[PDB]
Write a protein that binds this ligand. Structure first.
Ligand SMILES: Nc1ncnc2c1ncn2[C@@H]1O[C@H](COP(=O)(O)OP(=O)(O)O)[C@@H](O)[C@H]1O
Ligand SMILES: Nc1ncnc2c1ncn2[C@@H]1O[C@H](COP(=O)(O)OP(=O)(O)O)[C@@H](O)[C@H]1O
Ligand SMILES: Nc1ncnc2c1ncn2[C@@H]1O[C@H](COP(=O)(O)OP(=O)(O)O)[C@@H](O)[C@H]1O
Ligand SMILES: Nc1ncnc2c1ncn2[C@@H]1O[C@H](COP(=O)(O)OP(=O)(O)O)[C@@H](O)[C@H]1O
Ligand SMILES: [Mg+2]
Ligand SMILES: [Mg+2]
Ligand SMILES: [Mg+2]
Ligand SMILES: [Mg+2]
Lengths: 371, 371, 371, 371
């Protein structure tokens, strides 16, 4: 049987087999095109690079992302990425391999339908399925009750689950994600004298964010300590040299999550969004939801995000009850792990969308089957 | 022999064996159905919960009561409750166990007939019986003369008995019960800012009534003290927190029993209903009926109901004689205790309705046997 | 001269002029009071409705009857009814109009005295009279000998008259009347599932009795036919719909007259009460009393009451003589007709109670004049 | 005298003089605050805009509503709105002008008391009054009997009135209103690709609802026609362009009124809520209530709401009687019209709450005067 699991995401692709411990193929979802003249002969060089190949040669080509905010915008580029992760990296023939895909909540309906057409016609898979990302995150932890805040690169969303029952009317979606955090870092870096405008230079700024930035417990008095002393500065070495220094911008970029007014959005922070979802549910189920808060998604991997979230939540909730933010140690590959577990149960082998059903019903079978 | 005793009631089920001191199984009579979508797999969750299981998971399912005002309205749900109290809780086989059932006065005749069909065919009991609830309340106290006011959750009724002879023409029945008291509390709680509309939130309001409400000796001057001082307020903590305060609504809900015009009914209070029953009997037996007033039924467990009833009764009766309201200390499990006593006498072993009689005569044997 | 005739009765008022054929004003004796809040303005609505007006608006107000069992209990309400039948309906000035009133046998003496005070002082009638109801029933039929059984809504009474001479020691009075028949119908209607408890819903039950109920010749074998076949059922449509079905309760309510043990009274039926009165008279006058039995009063208008009475009477009397129950075709307005005849004879114009006699003697002149 | 009439409502303010035909001032109840930096000088721009001014400049400021679900939550903002409708729009001095206010049923008591304090102290009105909104709706139609369903933007409520008498125990209140309908439209619009998250973009979605949405007679077969053909689609032009298309969402948003499970509420629809109120009244008054159903309130202005309500009501009521939903042509300004009529009668000039009474008694005089 050997079912396949694929996590498209936005900016990172995780692929592997069902029943394993970790994905066997991780690579960025980027397609590049040459930019310059192209002199000399006998080189035999390709016209487009996809995956980790584009990262190595990013100095002469332009990076482009097909998926954005969860929705796929370039369908011609996505067929190139799926071909790369099936024949070149996994080295498998999809003709005898059911696949599992993931999808964010509150997405256009046409997004699901087009994914089914490509897999069932271009690749000719025998079966396929589509599942919500945040539901699979609860399978990895071996739990049944709790509220999951899954923040990635495209979109962060919230959904409460109580004893295997979802509440579709208490689901909140917010655009703020890790991609908008990188752009804010680029803007506030110009006040020190550094300019980063090329699309190939957006990777330089992203790597700085992943290594230096951190979340401060308190914002008012942290800016006071950084204003006087210089003990909060670290150095980064660019690829060609010219080391740089980072001061109070180190803890200012992640703060946008709790104060989304730094870019201009009117929505509330992630600490108030998750409180409104809890108060939208029933009265007697809120007690179990407070003590089962789950964190998932790489943008929730900042040093100190678990203690800051706890401090703000207890300021709103009544003081009688106990609030504990359950942040596991491996939060980035939590969705994939849940997908592998789900695709191995004996009771799940009846909900596959077969080829016969698609031929008789058409692409509209997804909404009647998947969710 | 080991006869069985069951008290269906309305909202609470008492079951046990004959010859014991207390019922061994007490649980609400509630059947619940899931309401929400139901995501995830491998849970193996049931489609309906009955009894104490529904109370634990009441936050996602809907509560429904089959019995109402004494009459059973959902016969499909009642067979589910009887199955729960025979195999799951009592853990007994009804094939070799006679059972005893209770019934309120002035009920539709078809109610008795359908109960006999289910027990004698679905469960195949060897014998069965049906008795009036208020008659059994006199067995518990070891008395022979007196007037019994049995107020429960569905219906309150009155019946006088003098030296082992009943007076069927002096029996009064009034709908006002504990279920209508909870609904009135919900309506008058909105004037302070609290909203309780979900059927799962009716249990929250009921628990407040069972812990805080009390009966005031006088109504006119009690409202004057509560209007000026704030020494009559208590606090209640909701399951999620947000403690609340109760003022003069504390003693206003139980007052509806004595003044049924608060909801809109035209009938008189319980103090005047029991006086009319006494005056409907013979002249020379009224003296023994005045001094043998008996209270039974949980809704007669309010703090102060015994002194208030005495004050109103002596205002109508002549001042020569003595009026004493005999309110025992355990009034909730008084009917069950009387049923256990009755099902153990050697002289009662001849009035069982046998299987042979039912086959020859049919379901109409009850009216010719029971009452 | 134009004397006036008024028949107070109990539950129905008959008024008119002397010398006519039928009463010109018939309306119930009911006074109603508003029950609900009473929102809005500019309506100009009264605080009390009396007569046929209360029947139209009975859905928001409470019905109350002043006269009961023959005796008047609410003297303030009776002055309201008398004012309605003199100025509003008859449209006459009582200052120049002698009036005639009726009274049941064996009544408190204070009942007669208070009626004389009100008429002679509040209304200032020039003359008045009080007569026994059952004596006037013999004037309508143009007879001189016979025994009259007058059953109405308040009380049924018996009195034998032989050739213009009454026998005061052979007069029997029984409370059982049409008002107790309606209450019994309400109680036995609950065994089918219908509840009628509001005082405004007592009119619904009364109308069912006047249209469907009938008297059965034999009771033992009639219950056998109704137990097997369903050919004895009729349908009634309530004002809002929800039609109902009546089975063996159709002929059970009127049976209470012959078997007064259904409510709990110890007295004998109307067939045995009228036999005891005959045997209480002299031996040689019984022959003419047997063949001159007269029926009067609306509660004697049930279909089949004349044949049932004959069957029971001949079972007690000797078989030699002939028994014939003379039931006329218009038995409801028989008392009024007799009153009109009496108030027109030239020999009756000397027994009026004048204003001069009342002033000199006082209210005690009635007992010395009327009976 | 020239009494003043004000209808606060929730989201729309109607003001005018007593004795006219239409309100002279209609404007939204919205207070806005600047959001952005605010460069340049010499502009002289205000710090807060209230009324129609905020709608024009809504692109840079944030809209906020003080009144919500009937209860006022921001008392500082309400004093700003009342000042705007007295000096800026009506251009009147409230020192010599009695005012009339409206209030929804089943509201916190403190809501009425605080309104009296502000008017009698800050504005110094000589007299004032508070009336129920649904009672005034019957004055406009010139009727005395009927059941009124008043659905607005904050809360829909029901109350039956029979011949100028209200039934307080048959009053039902349901939160579902027009504000929850707009939020549902925003959520289901994301499935086509349109995002509307800014509070200033909630006005864009509301305008779409007021122009395109309609109620379908049947829901099951209407979704079948929209699934196959494309004849049920209309186009809307956004302020900057980018026209959009609406398909089956056109008739899905108003359907929430009849099926409140689309959001997650457990209560029944408006067709079943109004049927339960009728069955809660007396038996003989239901006939006049069925034929006098009155519609009022802008959310009852959807194309086809009158025919759909009739179809569902006759499915529950008995088939004998006639049901007619009396939906007038101008249902939005029905409450104001009734208030103008009431404040002009000569008999109403005695129920004003004077300044002298307030000084002697205090703010608690309202409950003893108004309702
Ligand atoms: N150690 C880290 N600290 C902070 N942010 C991180 C870290 N690792 C990854 N990220 C952020 O997480 C994002 C990747 O999220 P990912 O789990 O791939 O979501 P998706 O699968 O939906 O693309 C990147 O944009 C990156 O900015
Ligand atoms: N301590 C108490 N004080 C006041 N009311 C009570 C108390 N305990 C129970 N009740 C009321 O009594 C009702 C239960 O009555 P119950 O004895 O179960 O009658 P039945 O057996 O006919 O259901 C409940 O509705 C509850 O409101
Ligand atoms: N057609 C009928 N069949 C049976 N009973 C009737 C009929 N008409 C009237 N009655 C009964 O007769 C009573 C009216 O009696 P009525 O002649 O008014 O006596 P009174 O004048 O003393 O009130 C009512 O209570 C009603 O129940
Ligand atoms: N033509 C229309 N069709 C449908 N809904 C409407 C229409 N006009 C107004 N509404 C709705 O009615 C609401 C306004 O109700 P309103 O009469 O102002 O009540 P209130 O005075 O209590 O605010 C708005 O929220 C709007 O959604
Ligand atoms: Mg992710
Ligand atoms: Mg009980
Ligand atoms: Mg009569
Ligand atoms: Mg309105």
């Amino acid at each position: 049987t050997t079912a396949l699991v694929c996590d498209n995401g936005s900016g990172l692709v995780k692929a592997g087999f069902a029943g394993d411990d970790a994905p066997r193929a991780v690579f960025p979802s980027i397609v590049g095109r040459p930019r310059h003249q192209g002199v000399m002969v006998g080189m035999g060089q390709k016209d487009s690079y996809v995956g980790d190949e584009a990262q190595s040669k990013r100095g002469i080509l332009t990076l482009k992302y097909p998926i954005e905010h969860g929705i796929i915008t370039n369908w011609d580029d996505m067929e190139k990425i799926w071909h790369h992760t099936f024949y070149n990296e996994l080295r498998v023939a999809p003709e005898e391999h059911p696949t599992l895909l993931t999808e964010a909540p509150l997405n256009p309906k046409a997004n699901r339908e087009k994914m089914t057409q490509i897999m069932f016609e271009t690749f000719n898979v025998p079966a396929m399925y589509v599942a919500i990302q945040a539901v699979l995150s609860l399978y990895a932890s071996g739990r049944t009750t709790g509220i999951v805040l899954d923040s990635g690169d495209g979109v962060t969303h919230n959904v409460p689950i109580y004893e295997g029952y979802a509440l579709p009317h208490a689901i909140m979606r917010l655009d703020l994600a890790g991609r908008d955090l990188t752009d804010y870092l680029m803007k506030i870096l110009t006040e020190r004298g550094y300019s980063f405008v090329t699309t190939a230079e957006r990777e330089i700024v992203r790597d700085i964010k992943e290594k230096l930035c951190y979340v401060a417990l308190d914002f008012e008095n942290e800016m006071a300590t950084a204003a006087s002393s210089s003990s909060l500065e670290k150095s980064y070495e660019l690829p060609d040299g010219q080391v740089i220094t980072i001061g109070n911008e180190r803890f200012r970029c992640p703060e946008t999550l709790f104060q989304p007014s730094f870019i201009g959005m009117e929505s509330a922070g992630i600490h108030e969004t998750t409180y409104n979802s809890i108060m939208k549910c029933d009265i007697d189920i809120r007690k179990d939801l407070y003590a089962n808060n789950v964190l998932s998604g790489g943008t929730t991997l900042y040093p100190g995000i678990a203690d800051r979230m706890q401090k703000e939540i207890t300021a709103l909730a009544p003081s009688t009850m106990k609030i504990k933010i359950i942040a596991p140690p491996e939060r980035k590959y939590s969705v994939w792990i849940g997908g592998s577990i789900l695709a191995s149960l004996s009771t799940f082998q009846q909900m596959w969308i077969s080829k016969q059903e698609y031929d008789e019903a058409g692409p509209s079978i997804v909404h009647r089957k998947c969710f």
